Amino acid sequence: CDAFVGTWKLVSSENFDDYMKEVGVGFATRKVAGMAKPNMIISVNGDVITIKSESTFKNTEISFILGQEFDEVTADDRKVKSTITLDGGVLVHVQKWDGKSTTIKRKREDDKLVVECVMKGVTSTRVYERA
Ligand SMILES: O=C(O)c1cccc2c3c(n(Cc4ccccc4C(F)(F)F)c12)CCCC3
């Protein structure tokens, strides 16, 4: 996938604190992550997609191949098993840990990058626009 290629800036966010709460993020990290306004910078070299999120709070980065499970340390220090695929133009990213799982979908919508984060019954939506 490449229509995702570019530098993206968070412009709106709903339910992110609830989402983080359900995932199990401690209060102190929620407070600083919630206020954060990260850049998500996505690139692709052949079959390796790289995604970087930068903020004063924390920078993270993952590089992966569609369909191949990899170990991820998250911004909230969970050690998860991640598997990201491309489904009908949507990048679906799944993280598995302690028998729990959360799904993060990234999709292009007009000129936005829309991110839907789901944990159990909570759904958070985050909108990023080209910088
Ligand atoms: O950037 C995001 O929008 C984002 C999207 C999906 C899940 C998460 C999680 C987090 N964030 C925010 C994030 C990710 C990576 C780096 C920086 C941040 C920041 F700054 F908190 F927004 C997410 C924080 C840890 C809980 C899981």
Tell me the domain boundaries of the chain: 1-131
Which residue type is seen at 59? N
**Backbone phi and psi for residue 22, each to the nearest 5 degrees, phi listed first:** -65, -30
Helices (DSSP H) in 1-131: which residue ranges? 16-23, 27-35
* H or E element, residue 97: strand 90-97
What Rg value do the Cα atoms of the chain yield, rounded? 14
Structure token digits, residue 120: 């159990």
**Is residue 127 a known part of a binding site?**
yes
Say how many C-beta atoms besides its own lie within 10 A of residue 98's C-beta. Answer: 9
C-alpha 19/C-alpha 124 separation (Å) is 6
Residue nearest (by alpha carbon) to ligand 1 atom 10 = 75
State the DSSP code for 56: S
**Amino acid at position 61, single letter:** E
Resolution to one decimal, Å: 2.2
Phi, psi of 75 (to 5 degrees): -55, -30
In whole angstroms, what is the distance from residue 70 CA to residue 27 CA? 27
Among 1, 16, 19, 17, CA closest to 122: 19
Task: Provide the 8-state DSSP code for 48.
Answer: E
Phi, psi of 4 (to 5 degrees): -100, -5
Angstrom distance (rounded) from CA 114 to CA 57? 21
C-alpha 103, offset from chain centre? 9
Which residues' Cβ are closer than 6 Å to ligand 1? 20, 25, 33, 36, 38, 53, 55, 57-58, 60, 74-76, 104, 115, 117, 126
Contact status, residue 73 vs residue 86, Cβ threshold 8 Å: no
| Domain 1-131, classified CATH 3.60.15.10, yes or no | no
